[PDB]
Amino acid sequence: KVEKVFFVTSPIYYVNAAPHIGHVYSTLITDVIGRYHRVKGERVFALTGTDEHGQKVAEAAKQKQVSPYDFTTAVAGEFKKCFEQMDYSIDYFIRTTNEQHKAVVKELWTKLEQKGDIYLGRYEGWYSISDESFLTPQNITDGVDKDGNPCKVSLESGHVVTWVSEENYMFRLSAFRERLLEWYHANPGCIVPEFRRREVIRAVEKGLPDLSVSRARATLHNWAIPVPGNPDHCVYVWLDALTNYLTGSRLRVDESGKEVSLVDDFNELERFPADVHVIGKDILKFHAIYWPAFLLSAGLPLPKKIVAHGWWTKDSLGNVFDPVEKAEEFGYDALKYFLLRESGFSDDGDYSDKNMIARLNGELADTLGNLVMRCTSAKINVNGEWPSPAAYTEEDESLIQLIKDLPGTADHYYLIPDIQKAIIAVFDVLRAINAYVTDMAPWKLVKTDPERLRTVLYITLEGVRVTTLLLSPILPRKSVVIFDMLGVPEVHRKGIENFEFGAVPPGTRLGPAVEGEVLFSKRSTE
Numbered sequence: 075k076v077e078k079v080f081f082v083t084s085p086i087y088y089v090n091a092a093p094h095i096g097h098v099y100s101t102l103i104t105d106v107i108g109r110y111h112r113v114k115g116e117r118v119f120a121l122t123g124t125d126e127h128g129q130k131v132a133e134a135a136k137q138k139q140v141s142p143y144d145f146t147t148a149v150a151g152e153f154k155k156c157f158e159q160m161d162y163s164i165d166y167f168i169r170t171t172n173e174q175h176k177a178v179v180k181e182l183w184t185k186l187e188q189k190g191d192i193y194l195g196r197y198e199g200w201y202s203i204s205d206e207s208f209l210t211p212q213n214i215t216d217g218v219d220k221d222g223n224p225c226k227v228s229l230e231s232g233h234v235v236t237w238v239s240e241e242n243y244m245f246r247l248s249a250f251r252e253r254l255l256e257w258y259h260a261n262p263g264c265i266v267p268e269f270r271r272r273e274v275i276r277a278v279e280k281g282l283p284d285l286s287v288s289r290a291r292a293t294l295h296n297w298a299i300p301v302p303g304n305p306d307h308c309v310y311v312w313l314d315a316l317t318n319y320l321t322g323s324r325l326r327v328d329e330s331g332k333e334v335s336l337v338d339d340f341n342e343l344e345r346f347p348a349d350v351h352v353i354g355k356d357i358l359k360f361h362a363i364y365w366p367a368f369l370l371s372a373g374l375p376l377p378k379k380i381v382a383h384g385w386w387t388k389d390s391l392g393n394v395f396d397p398v399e400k401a402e403e404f405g406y407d408a409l410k411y412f413l414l415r416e417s418g419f420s421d422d423g424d425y426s427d428k429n430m431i432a433r434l435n436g437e438l439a440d441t442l443g444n445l446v447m448r449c450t451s452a453k454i455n456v457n458g459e460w461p462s463p464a465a466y467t468e469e470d471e472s473l474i475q476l477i478k479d480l481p482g483t484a485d486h487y488y489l490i491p492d493i494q495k496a497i498i499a500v501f502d503v504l505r506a507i508n509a510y511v512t513d514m515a516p517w518k519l520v521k522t523d524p525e526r527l528r529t530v531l532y533i534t535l536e537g538v539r540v541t542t543l544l545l546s547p548i549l550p551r552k553s554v555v556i557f558d559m560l561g562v563p564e565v566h567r568k569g570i571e572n573f574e575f576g577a578v579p580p581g582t583r584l585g586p587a588v589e590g591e592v593l594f595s596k597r598s599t600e
C-alpha cells in the first residue's frame with residue numbers, strides 16, 4: 075500500500091482508581107503488536123495513556139476529598155509507574171489534561187460544527203456515569219445500590235444508571251448510518267474478531283439516534299473541556315477521550331518521552347489514522363460507531379482495524395490478580411506469555427496458579443528452554459559453534475519446510491491480529507523440533523556419526539533462532555538471552571531478511587556459558 079508510521083494504540087484509562095490487570099492486558103496487546111512491527115523493521119508509534127476528565131473521575135476525586143488536578147496527576151503517575159515496571163516499549167503516554175490535547179479537541183469540535191453536524195438539542199434519558207455511556211430503556215433493568223435500595227442498572231455493565239434531562243449539543247450520528255454501513259461492508263477486516271463486527275453491523279442496521287456531545291458544566295463539576303463558543307457546556311468526555319488518538323498522532327516527542335510540539339497537520343508525522351486500535355469489548359460502540367462517524371464528519375481518514383479482546387477494559391469480593399506480584403513470582407516474560415497464550419477473544423481462560431505453572435513448565439521450560447539448552451550444551455555442541463550441515467534427509471527437509479513456512483504463517487496471525495494463534499503456531503514448530511531431536515538422539519551421534527550430528531545440530535539451532543525471533547515481541551528479555559546463548563549477531567535479531575532459513579552462517583560462535591544457567595526454571599506443583 076503506502077509507507078507510513080505503523081500506528082497502534084491502546085485505550086486511555088479512567089484514573090478513578092489504581093491500575094490493575096485489565097489495563098496491563100490492554101496495553102500488553104498494544105505493545106506486542108508494536109514490537110512485532112519493529113522487528114519487521116517498520117517505523118512504529120505505540121500510544122497509551124489516561125482518560126482524566128469527566129464526572130466519574132471528578133466524583134472519585136471528591137470521594138477521596140482531593141482536588142481533581144492533584145488526584146488525576148497522582149493516579150496518572152501510578153499508571154506510568156506500573157507500565158514502566160511492566161517493561162513495555164510504548165512510544166508515548168498521553169493524558170487528556172494535556173494542554174495540547176485540549177487544543178486538538180477544540181479544532182475537531184469546530185470542524186464538526188462547521189460541517190453542520192452539531193446542533194443545540196436535549197438529551198432526556200438514561201446514563202451510566204461509571205461507563206460515561208448513554209443508554210436506551212432496552213439497555214437497563216432492575217438492581218440495587220450499596221444502600222440496598224432498588225435502582226436501575228445498565229444491562230451492559232451492571233452499574234447504576236440515572237435519568238438525565240439537559241439541553242445539550244447533539245452530534246448528527248443518525249445521518250451517518252448509511253456511510254458507516256458502507257465502511258463495514260467495504261472493509262470486512264476492519265473490526266476483529268468477526269462476531270464483534272457482526273454485532274456492530276446489526277446495531278447500526280437497526281438505526282442510530284443522535285448523540286449528546288456536550289453537558290451542562292455543573293453536572294461535570296467543571297472538570298472537562300469547555301465547548302468552543304459556549305462556556306456553559308463541557309465537551310462529552312468520550313469525544314474528548316477518542317480525540318487522544320488524533321492528538322497523539324500530532325505530537326513530536328523527545329528522547330525522554332516528553333511531548334515538545336503539536337504539529338498543525340497530522341500528515342507531517344505520518345501516523346494518522348491508526349493501523350490498529352486495541353480495545354476491550356466494553357467500549358466497542360465508541361470506537362466502531364462514534365469515532366468513525368466523527369471522522370467522516372470532520373473529513374479525517376478512518377482507522378484500518380479495531381481489535382476488541384474478551385477482557386473488560388475495567389472491572390473486589392476476595393479475588394485478586396496483581397500484575398507485578400505475579401511477574402515477580404513467575405517472571406515478567408512468562409506472565410506476558412501466559413496472558414497472551416491463555417486468552418483468545420473470550421472470557422473462557424483459566425488464570426489459576428495451577429494453569430500458570432503448567433504452561434510455564436510445559437511450554438516455556440520443557441518445550442523451549444530444554445531445546446535451547448540441548449543445542450548449546452557442551453555435551454552435544456562440542457565445538458560451541460554453528461556447524462556446517464551435511465546433506466539433508468527427507469526427515470530433515472520436512473522440519474526445514476516447517477521452519478521456512480513459519481514466518482509467513484505467524485505474520486498473518488500477527489496482522490489479524492490474533493497473537494494467541496501466532497504463539498500456538500510457533501510452539502507447534504518448537505514441538506516438531508523437539509520430536510526431531512528425540513528421533514535423531516544427537517547425544518548418541520557425538521560418538522557415532524559426527525558428520526550426521528553437524529546436520530541435526532545446524533537445523534536445530536536455526537529452528538530455535540527463527541522461532542525465538544518470532545517469539546521476541548512476546549518474550550523480549552528472554553529472546554535476548556536466547557540469542558546471546560546462540561551467539562546470534564545483533565544485526566540478525568530483526569528484519570524480514572532474518573526470517574529466512576540460513577541467515578546466520580556456519581562457524582558463528584556460541585555465546586559464553588554460565589554455571590547453572592537458568593532460562594525458565596520449573597516451579598513445584600502445590
Ligand code: MET
Nearest residue numbers: 085086087088125315316
Ligand atoms: C478513547 S478510549 C477511552 C476508554 C475509557 N476511558 C475507559 O477507561 O474505559
